[PDB]
């Protein structure tokens, strides 16, 4: 067919503001045909990591129920976003199941989030790990003992969140990085989003 429908992945990848990790932005994309070659063929995306499918056959295959997750983190922990890893961000702010069928894109945003900047938070204390793709939103005074403290912080009473000092003059690993994680299912339903067909 002459004209093929397309969905705006650009606005996802080109947005003024992103959500913090402890409240990760989740979006659903359906009923479109979006080329995937233009992504890994670019140079701005510093990290294009995924194993379940090669970049070459991204456009070859067709998928269903495309979900996108967006947030901003510190650089030195970009490794923690992978199937089956631990860490504060990998346990209390976001979870990635090992049986993951998707791909990961990460790139620097030093000149977009710098001063300095303080408005940045993430979950520090939580009861235990999270189920896959869980959204962990809450506000409670976690207690490191048995004495019950409520209302105000005190001894052994800790604030669940913490901010990030994204100074414009930081080195590698401390500059904020923007991360987009794409997930989907392999046509478990009638096809919704396929690759671009050649002519």
């Amino acid at each position: 067919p002459n004209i093929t429908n397309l969905c705006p992945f650009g606005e996802v990848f080109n947005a003024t503001r992103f959500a913090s990790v402890y409240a990760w932005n989740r979006k659903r994309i359906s009923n479109c045909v979006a080329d995937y070659s233009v992504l890994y063929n670019s140079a701005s995306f510093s990290t294009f990591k995924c194993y379940g499918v090669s970049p070459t056959k991204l456009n070859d295959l067709c998928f269903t129920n495309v979900y996108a997750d967006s947030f901003v983190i510190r650089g030195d922990e970009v490794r923690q976003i992978a199937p089956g890893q631990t860490g504060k961000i990998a346990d209390y702010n976001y979870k990635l199941p090992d049986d993951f069928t998707g791909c990961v894109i990460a790139w620097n945003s030093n000149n977009l989030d710098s001063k300095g900047n303080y408005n940045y938070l993430y979950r520090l204390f939580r009861k235990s790990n999270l189920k896959p793709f869980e959204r962990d939103i809450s506000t409670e005074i976690y207690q490191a003992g048995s004495t019950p403290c409520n209302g105000v912080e005190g001894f052994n009473c800790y604030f669940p969140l913490q901010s990030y000092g994204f100074q414009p003059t930081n080195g590698v690993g401390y500059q904020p990085y923007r991360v987009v994680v794409l997930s989907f299912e392999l046509l478990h339903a009638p096809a919704t989003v396929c690759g671009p067909k050649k002519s």
Partner: antibody
Amino acid sequence: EVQLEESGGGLVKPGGSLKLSCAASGFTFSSYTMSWVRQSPEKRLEWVAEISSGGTYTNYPDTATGRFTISRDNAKNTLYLEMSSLRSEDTAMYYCANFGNYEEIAYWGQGTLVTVSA
Amino acid sequence: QIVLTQSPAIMSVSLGERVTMTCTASSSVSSSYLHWYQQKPGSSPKLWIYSTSNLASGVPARFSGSGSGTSYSLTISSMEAEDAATYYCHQYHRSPYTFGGGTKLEIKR
């Protein structure tokens, strides 16, 4: 690496200006932000002034706003720092180290005695 | 900025026992930005405890501690002969960077 040789120091006059050159070699200097710290005899440490090698940016504390200047040179891998109109109270010994760069902060300088005299 | 305050000025603590040391500040700095160096007499400082929980190279897993908010705690297990050194608190969150007041750790016979 060979651990950040600093330029040799010595006694000066209250009204001169001494230059500290923390030249080194052994790791990339296009992405490693340097820093300058000083210690007076038996007194708490104090971050003098740091440089940003990513775009060679200058920012440093407000205890002395206009009398600290840093010049980086990635070509010959050298780090100039100087102060204007040094006083007799500025006697200390200086380190050049690595701040803000890759998480594993390490590699403090060998130190250099930069003291004043009268 | 935030000045780093150490509750004890000096520890004339005998050999063998196990105590704790505190770094106090006027406000919460970060979950993991602060760290501690070790300035030996007539030498340069070296970092062991980074990220407020993790340990750098060379630590025999003897030196530890935990804390968050406006006060942090660093603990030991059993004093030995090489503990006669100096420790300095740090903070990397605000524009200005400061150091801890320092503690002149010493052993008693």
